[PDB]
């Protein structure tokens, strides 16, 4: 028959949920965001399209902090990403309250995944429209995860989602091949700036602003912090050199 | 407490109720009708805690009138007594129970028989030839037990109730300011013009 793509949680004769795939398309329509796991932490980066010079630069932050050690950046429908980040913050607060210890990165990943999978379980709720790359440093070291609107989430050496996800994935594969020992935190920041600058060329019609955060056991003592000032400009210059 | 008396003669039921309402050291009113006509052939006298009495009586009255309107039929006195007893029994275990004692006097037209029911604030119903609520019985019964005959006429019952009221006005530490007397018979509920 027909009509399997009009209601959420409805399995097509193939075994698919078409509304989830449409949400994935909505994600693919979003900007490019990447995460890079280094030897002692993770680095998140995102492109912010400067639709007009009326936008206040360095403001309109896109990377959200969870607890004090988790970083999250979502590609797709930004409001849905904020909803998911708020839910994750509530989950982290609950975990810390009950077990005192801060929530581990895998636990947080599974919480977000179960939330999204529940959102893919009823025809009364729309699937999420954001792919979220998140992670941080816990007692077991660095962790980088990516979660899709289907509720599927995995741990990554490097992850990327958005319009320029393919070029970013190729550059991340190059980085993984050329660095088996692992990247350093600042090297990961420079590579994230480079990959963001390289993926902007797909939509070079309008100028963009780079936003980078990192959580490193040595560089930030395990806390999620926004890369700003001298390091951000250094990464921007590194990328500008790398393009040409 | 308030004086609530009732007697069941061969073809009528007579109800006596105190005319006095006293709050504190001041008698606020000396002409209080402590009865509610539940149905054209069923009257109910009540006494007890201030406020609860009138509230419960008017609630029962409204329910009985609603039933009579819905079914176009007057419930037998037994049915009304059972309904009010169930209400009081549900009340006793509520948060704020009703503290009301009632005497129901009716004339079963289907049986053409007088019927008198005594129910307390707990839901203890009894069908008795003569009944009383409060300390009143402690005197009146002793008279009635001797001077009550089943074949008594309404005038004989009125004289017996007058004797009971005289004994109460003699040996009671309270001035209940007379009694309003009502007669329930086949022709309905009427009020004696004067009893003293």
């Amino acid at each position: 028959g027909t009509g399997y793509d009009l209601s959420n949680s409805v399995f097509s004769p193939d075994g698919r949920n078409f509304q989830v795939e449409y949400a994935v398309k909505a994600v693919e329509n979003g900007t490019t965001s990447i995460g890079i796991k280094c030897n002692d932490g993770v680095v998140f980066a995102v492109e912010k399209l400067i639709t007009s010079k009326l936008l206040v630069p360095q403001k309109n932050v896109k990377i959200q902090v969870v607890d004090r050690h988790i970083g999250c950046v979502y590609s797709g429908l930004i409001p849905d990403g904020r909803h998911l980040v708020n839910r994750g913050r509530e989950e982290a607060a609950s975990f810390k309250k009950l077990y005192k210890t801060p929530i581990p990165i895998p636990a947080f990943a599974d919480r977000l995944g179960q939330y999204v999978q529940a959102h893919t379980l009823y025809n009364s709720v729309r699937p999420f429209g954001v792919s979220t790359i998140f992670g941080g440093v816990d007692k077991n070291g660095a962790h980088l995860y990516m979660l899709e609107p289907s509720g599927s989430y995995w741990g990554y050496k490097g992850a990327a989602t958005g319009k320029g996800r393919q070029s970013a994935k190729a550059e991340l594969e190059k980085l993984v091949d050329h660095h088996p020992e692992g990247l350093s935190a600042r090297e990961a920041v420079k590579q994230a700036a480079k990959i963001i600058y390289l993926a902007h060329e797909d939509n070079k019609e309008k100028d963009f602003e780079l936003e980078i955060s990192w959580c490193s056991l040595s560089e930030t003592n395990g806390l999620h912090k926004f890369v700003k000032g001298d390091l951000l400009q250094e990464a921007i210059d590194f990328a500008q050199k790398e393009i040409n | 407490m308030d004086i609530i008396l009732g007697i069941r003669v061969q073809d009528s039921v007579i109800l006596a109720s105190s005319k006095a309402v006293t709050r504190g050291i001041s008698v606020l009113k000396d002409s209080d009708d402590k009865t509610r006509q539940l149905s054209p052939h069923t009257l109910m006298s009540f006494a007890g805690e201030a406020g609860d009495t009138v509230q419960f009586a008017e609630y029962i009255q409204a329910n009985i009138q609603l039933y009579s309107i819905r079914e176009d039929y007057e419930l037998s006195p037994q049915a009304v007594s059972s309904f009010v007893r169930q209400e009081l029994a549900k009340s006793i275990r509520s948060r704020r129970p009703y503290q009301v004692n009632v005497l129901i006097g009716g004339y079963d037209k289907k049986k053409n028989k007088p019927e008198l029911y005594q129910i307390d604030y707990l839901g203890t119903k009894v069908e008795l030839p003569y009944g009383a609520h409060g300390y009143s019985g402690f005197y009146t019964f002793s008279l009635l037990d001797h001077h009550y005959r089943p074949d008594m006429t309404t005038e004989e019952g009125l004289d017996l109730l007058k004797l009971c009221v005289q004994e109460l006005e003699k040996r009671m530490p309270m001035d209940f300011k007379g009694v309003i007397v009502k007669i329930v018979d086949k022709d309905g509920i009427r009020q004696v013009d004067d009893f003293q």
Partner: protein, 231 residues
């Protein structure tokens, strides 16, 4: 097409249609422009009357002594959102003795709208908002869309023919961003911006509303003769 019945249904292209219909409802509303320097923030709105016997619908709402907003679209949804924003500012001031940050207000509005753009039986809001405020960071101007997207800008405009005012603000950005400590000059700049979006109409005392906030200047609204000096 077959995907515009609810906000719980995703189009094959990944588009929520009801949200776009609300945005279109905004586009057909009146024109309101916002612009801010480092010291002040101004909202200039053109109110619209049903006919010549009717009043002009109010487009600017005061949320707190340091923050206000101008509306474009459904006035009921605008009132609902402004009341929620008043409640949030009130809660901040009562529980923390703290003026609510404009950025946090934008975040709260975004999440509030997203609550409606994902659940069955709920319609998205049908109004765009321009929020001016002065918090501990300085002057702030935000544009809020019922899609849940709130963006901070030096200047912007929404409603009918808003692109003219937006382009005017883009051209005059380096000029107005430096109008610090002079309210009337920023007010005139906003009046010119909104005039850049007029067609067969002229600004009168009856159709123009202005709102100003900033350092040592609480959120004050000017209507009627109060705007005669800016026309």
């Amino acid at each position: 097409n077959n995907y515009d019945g609810d906000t719980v249904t995703f189009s094959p292209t990944g588009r929520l249609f009801q949200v776009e219909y609300a945005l279109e409802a905004i586009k057909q509303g009146s024109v309101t422009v916002g612009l801010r320097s480092n010291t002040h923030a101004v909202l200039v709105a053109l109110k619209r009357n049903a006919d010549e016997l009717s009043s002009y619908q109010k487009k600017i709402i005061k949320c707190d002594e340091h923050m206000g907003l101008s509306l474009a679209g459904l006035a009921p949804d605008a009132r609902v959102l402004s009341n929620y924003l008043r409640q949030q500012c009130n809660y901040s001031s009562l529980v923390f003795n703290r003026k609510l940050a404009v950025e946090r207000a934008g975040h709260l509005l975004c999440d509030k709208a997203q609550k409606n753009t994902q659940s069955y039986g709920g319609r998205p809001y049908g109004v765009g908002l321009l929020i001016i405020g002065y918090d501990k960071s300085g002057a702030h101007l935000l544009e809020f869309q019922p899609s849940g997207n709130v963006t901070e800008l030096y200047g912007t405009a929404i409603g009918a023919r808003s692109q003219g005012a937006k382009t005017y603000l883009e051209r005059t950005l380096d000029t107005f961003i430096k109008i610090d400590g002079n309210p009337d000059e920023l007010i005139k700049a906003g009046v010119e911006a909104i005039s850049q979006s007029l067609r067969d109409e002229s600004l009168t005392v009856d159709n123009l509303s202005i709102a100003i906030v900033g350092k040592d200047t609480p959120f004050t609204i000017y209507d009627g003769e109060a705007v005669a000096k800016y026309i």
